[model samples]
Target: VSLPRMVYPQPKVLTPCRKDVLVVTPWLAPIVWEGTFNIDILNEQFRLQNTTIGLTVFAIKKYVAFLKLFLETAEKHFMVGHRVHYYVFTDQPAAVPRVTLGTGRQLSVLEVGRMEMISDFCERRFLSEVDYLVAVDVDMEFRDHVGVEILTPLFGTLHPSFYGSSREAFTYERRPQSQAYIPKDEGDFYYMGAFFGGSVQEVQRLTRACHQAMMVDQANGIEAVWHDESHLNKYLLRHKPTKVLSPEYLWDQQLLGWPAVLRKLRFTAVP
Candidate 1:
């Protein structure tokens, strides 16, 4: 597979695009940021393989109201030219809106009531459908380009609140009895459960691990501090993601305000 000849601005060796922030993880994974990628080149690589991206979002109860804005704005920015299949798992299928989509993009509303979220995702359908699966919160919108640069075997976004905080400050499960417990001295990043995904197999393994761990805690009558998110941090700490997304990919401008370090706000909270 070869990329077609195309001319774009050459990258400079002496000057760095983002000197203010960390661009690479200690484990050598590229941290996705606005200035760190050439979307044109990445898009060409993905398009060459005809990548089909499957996005899974849960919209139980009132969350279904957010689907219209979520899907509409996603059509404008998320994987623009690539084939996209959106799976909206919800209790109210009738509540899911009928938003228009791009040519190669389509949506499916699966009815589920109180089912284990990602644990059920490991089912056979996803393996036969898309090459990658991106699990995200339904209450957000795409505010900027979120193309192929974010895709990898496994990846997680830094939580907006704890991105710059020290490991001691992260709200990881502290009780050693719980499966999600993390010692105060250990943590690479506090990854948010709201957004995380990878290749179908990798994502399935991750969700399966988390679900099993959570079940163990439930049987013991203990719960992690942040529920699924606490387990997510534990998993990412043990099995580092191949790529890490900066807080720019997941932010709440209203709560954190626009920091000088973030150049582009990709996916963000609605309010």
Candidate 2:
């Protein structure tokens, strides 16, 4: 893969309140994407660096219905007042929507094949153009004010890469059934579920490392247990992400805990 190139304006100066917004990329959509948009925070203005806001479910039309509800809810609650650029990477651009984020934000689509290609574009092409970068999954939704506080301290913090959940939750196995080897005392492994944000330069380093680890893992018979999650954990273990966020930022339905409940009631219900 090509290296991240230096660009003008630099990432340090980009602030969240400014016109520059966060960007996200996801794989399968419609479900989590719509749920995420239903929250009030998205209306503020954010850059989506992937395809459609809704994921395409070929078999189940119900998925589309879910997306419609999500879109409508997003429309009702989240009003886009600023520009949002959606960089769509797909082979068939016609299959995606012509418009996204309503009137305030615009959609820009680019055609590409693999998910790995994002590493090249993010590092070599767009890092300098935007203030910050958020690599996220479509399955994630914000239940509270995490987005508002997520990237705030990134500007001046050292080792500024932030992961949503604690380091203990990450794994490398594909199926939860599979057994994998992780150090018992190891403390650095973390999961990459919803959002991971930081300076373009910090993220550029992470993306590059993730891409390299992905290639190596693919070559070996050992598939990462958590796919990119495993690689992200390994990276964080070595590099140590500076800004660690609470579980409220990337609350998972699968987990049994209830710390997220207070977060949802406090933030999501209010605004």
Candidate 3:
């Protein structure tokens, strides 16, 4: 397949797009940030492949209130031109907001029924429907472009609260008895559980591993400090992501004031 000839500003080899921050990780995986990628090129490449992205969000209990704003703003910024399948998992099927979607977009509201940690039903449906699965928190909005540039085999967003802190400062599960245990001396970056994804296959593998580890912890009469997020951090530690999203992808402007380092606050907290 050949890309149609189009005119755009040429990229410079010596002059890096972002000199203030590290754009690539130690293992050569890209750390997605604004100015580091050209959206035009990424959009064209993803569109060429007819990529379908499945975005999963849990809105159980009172979290259903955030669905309207979440879905509406998502239409404005999330994978705009590409095929988007928004999966809203909620216990209240009737309460799911009815938000109109774009031409290449669709929405499915699946009931979690009771909160029994059951997800096998929904998993089978989406695995065959999408090329990638992006699971994010419900109480957030898209304030800036979150496009295909962030797509890869597996990726995690640096936690907004601890991105600039040292590894020892990361709030990881330190209990030796817990499955999510990570010694204070070892940690990459504290990854936020709110925003993470990858190819459907990889996402499945990661989630399954986390669930199994969590069950083991539960059987041992213990729970990780941050629950699933603690498990997520442990998983990414051993299996590094293909791409690491910067704090811009998952931010809380209200909690952590807008910093100069962040060029764009992409997907962010609502409070």
Candidate with the greatest TM-score versus the true structure? 1
- RMSD of every candidate to native, in Å, equals 1.3, 12.3, 1.7
Which is the winner by lDDT between candidate 2 and candidate 3? 3
Predicted candidate 2 versus true structure: per-residue lDDT over 181-239, tens digit per residue: 35535644354433464556676676677787667666765676656666665565566
Which portions of model 1 miss their true places by more than 4 Å?
none
Candidate 3 per-residue lDDT over residues 16-84, each given as its tens digit: 878788889888999998888889888889999999999988998899999999999999999999999
lDDT (0 to 1) per candidate: 0.91, 0.40, 0.89
TM-scores of the candidates are 0.97, 0.54, 0.96
Cα lDDT of model 1 by residue, 76-138, tens digit = 999999999999998999999889998999898888851156557436888888999999999
**Which wins on lDDT, candidate 1 or candidate 3?**
1
- Steric collisions counted per model: 0, 9, 0
**Which residue segments of model 2 deviate by more than 4 Å?**
1-84, 98-104, 140-148, 152-182, 254-261, 265-271
